[PDB]
Amino acid sequence: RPTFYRQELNKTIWEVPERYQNLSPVGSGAYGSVCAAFDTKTGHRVAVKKLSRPFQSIIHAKRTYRELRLLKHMKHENVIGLLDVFTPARSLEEFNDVYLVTHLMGADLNNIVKCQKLTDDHVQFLIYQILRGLKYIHSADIIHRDLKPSNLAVNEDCELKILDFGLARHTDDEMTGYVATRWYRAPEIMLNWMHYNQTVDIWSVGCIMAELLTGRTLFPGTDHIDQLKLILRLVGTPGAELLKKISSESARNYIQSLAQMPKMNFANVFIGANPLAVDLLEKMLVLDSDKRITAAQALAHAYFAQYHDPDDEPVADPYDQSFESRDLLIDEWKSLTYDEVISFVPPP
Numbered sequence: 345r346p347t348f349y350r351q352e353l354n355k356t357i358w359e360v361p362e363r364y365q366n367l368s369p370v371g372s373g374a375y376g377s378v379c380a381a382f383d384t385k386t387g388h389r390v391a392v393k394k395l396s397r398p399f400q401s402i403i404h405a406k407r408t409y410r411e412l413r414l415l416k417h418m419k420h421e422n423v424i425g426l427l428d429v430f431t432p433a434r435s436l437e438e439f440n441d442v443y444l445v446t447h448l449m450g451a452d453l454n455n456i457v458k459c460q461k462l463t464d465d466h467v468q469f470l471i472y473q474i475l476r477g478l479k480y481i482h483s484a485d486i487i488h489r490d491l492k493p494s495n496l497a498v499n500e501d502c503e504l505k506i507l508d509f510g511l512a513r514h515t516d517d518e519m520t521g522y523v524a525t526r527w528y529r530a531p532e533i534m535l536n537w538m539h540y541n542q543t544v545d546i547w548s549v550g551c552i553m554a555e556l557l558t559g560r561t562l563f564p565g566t567d568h569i570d571q572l573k574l575i576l577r578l579v580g581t582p583g584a585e586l587l588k589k590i591s592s593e594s595a596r597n598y599i600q601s602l603a604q605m606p607k608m609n610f611a612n613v614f615i616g617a618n619p620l621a622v623d624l625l626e627k628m629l630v631l632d633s634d635k636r637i638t639a640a641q642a643l644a645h646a647y648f649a650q651y652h653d654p655d656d657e658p659v660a661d662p663y664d665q666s667f668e669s670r671d672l673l674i675d676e677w678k679s680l681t682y683d684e685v686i687s688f689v690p691p692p
């Protein structure tokens with residue numbers, strides 16, 4: 345066990361191993377507070393997150409366990425991984441605080457799209473890396489659920505990492521109105537007409553790729569219904585084949601109230617774009633989610649011929665999510681979390 349030291353920063357007590365130095369606050373959401381630090385064991389600049397009230401309810405305790413299990417599994421060049429996890433507790437009986445350590449991230453894709461002139465070569469490389477990471481994530485039967493530019497870190501060499509997996513933490517108010525939190529969500533989950541599934545992540549990638557090509561949000565709706573109208577104007581209203589497969593009675597009733605619209609010509613929407621980029625966008629932004637291209641299929645599309653290497657696009661180890669259907673007490677979720685903290689083995 346390392347030696348810990350305590351300090352107060354922005355009215356919060358931080359108790360961390362001596363290896364972490366020069367702590368400086370960088371932000372705080374509803375899930376925890378974050379400091380930047382220098383890790384003297386590895387030489388990396390890191391982000392240290394102290395979870396806020398991790399075991400206050402069964403829902404929160406299960407969410408803490410879910411986040412730690414996910415971060416411990418992800419081992420891929422284009423996905424955020426876990427450098428360390430620690431607690432100052434010396435036993436399960438005094439266990440209360442959880443700290444997570446990751447590589448410190450600089451710019452996100454938001455900064456890039458609004459501040460930089462992107463070539464088509466830049467778009468190819470950035471979208472390639474998103475799909476490479478997504479092939480890995482989806483091969484473990486994980487759904488990200490919250491892909492958007494602020495959850496994609498990018499460095500000066502145009503190298504990209506996926507972060508901030510959806511832990512089922514977004515509320516109704518967070519999704520209301522003119523908000524980027526909803527602009528990248530697939531139509532079939534925006535009003536909960538379908539259960540989540542991995543095809544919703546490919547819809548998000550299509551929205552991101554369009555924005556890199558044009559510099560503008562693809563579907564900036566002022567509310568759920570305005571956004572649905574923007575979507576259906578581009579991709580068309582549901583045809584007979586898809587309508588037969590829509591089981592939600594709430595969806596069918598409202599959809600049939602709208603006048604029918606054909607799919608638009610994407611070459612007249614994305615003026616001047618590489619024809620191969622237009623072709624790929626048409627295969628991602630499909631209303632019928634059964635028919636969308638998959639991440640593994642998209643890596644082999646000719647738009648990525650410069651970068652595609654099928655011997656360097658790995659899949660994940662199997663990921664056991666059976667805990668998600670399990671009903672446990674707070675202290676049982678807490679004991680499971682403690683076991684995962686003390687069994688952590690750092691990367692090479």
Ligand SMILES: N#CCC(=O)Nc1ccc(OC(F)(F)F)cc1
Nearest residue numbers: 531532537538582589590591631
């Ligand atoms: N079950 C099943 C399939 C299904 O329900 N798919 C779907 C629903 C709603 C959709 O969105 C919109 F209503 F068409 F806008 C798109 C697809």
Ligand SMILES: [Cl-]
Nearest residue numbers: 346361362363
């Ligand atoms: Cl230490």
Ligand SMILES: [Cl-]
Nearest residue numbers: 423424425447
């Ligand atoms: Cl990482």
Ligand SMILES: [Cl-]
Nearest residue numbers: 433439440441
């Ligand atoms: Cl503790």
Ligand SMILES: [Cl-]
Nearest residue numbers: 492493494524
């Ligand atoms: Cl965003």
Ligand SMILES: [Cl-]
Nearest residue numbers: 662663664665
């Ligand atoms: Cl597992």
Ligand SMILES: [Mg+2]
Nearest residue numbers: 494495507508
């Ligand atoms: Mg985020």
